[PDB]
């Protein structure tokens, strides 16, 4: 019972079943890029104010 | 406390007059079952300070 699993876990008895532990982790990268001669047909419109 | 009178019921003077305030709140100084790194941690050891 979860009341009993204090006195098993907080004291230090292994309760008969073990865990897998999942964290998230995050890393910055420094990505290089590439392209070929013509990848984006790009367009520019007319300004409005 | 000061002892009073015969020593025979002096244990019994302790058991009856204290039983309400003794059984209700948990004692601070039984912290020996707390582990080493369970001592200095803030969870379950608000008696750190």
From Swiss-Prot, chain A:
Q: Where in the cell is it found?
A: Virion; Host nucleus
Q: Self-association or partners: how does it assemble?
A: Homomultimer. Makes the hexons and eleven out of twelve pentons. Interacts with triplex proteins 1/TRX1 and 2/TRX2; adjacent capsomers are linked together in groups of three by triplexes, heterotrimeric complexes composed of one molecule of TRX1 and two molecules of TRX2. Interacts with scaffold protein; this interaction allows efficient MCP transport to the host nucleus. Interacts with capsid vertex component 2/CVC2. Interacts with the small capsomere-interacting protein/SCP.
What's this chain's function?
Self-assembles to form an icosahedral capsid with a T=16 symmetry, about 200 nm in diameter, and consisting of 150 hexons and 12 pentons (total of 162 capsomers). Hexons form the edges and faces of the capsid and are each composed of six MCP molecules. In contrast, one penton is found at each of the 12 vertices. Eleven of the pentons are MCP pentamers, while the last vertex is occupied by the portal complex.
What is stated as this protein's family in its record?
Belongs to the herpesviridae major capsid protein family.
Q: What is this protein called?
A: Major capsid protein
Q: Which organism is it from?
A: Human herpesvirus 2 (strain HG52)
Q: Gene name? A: MCP
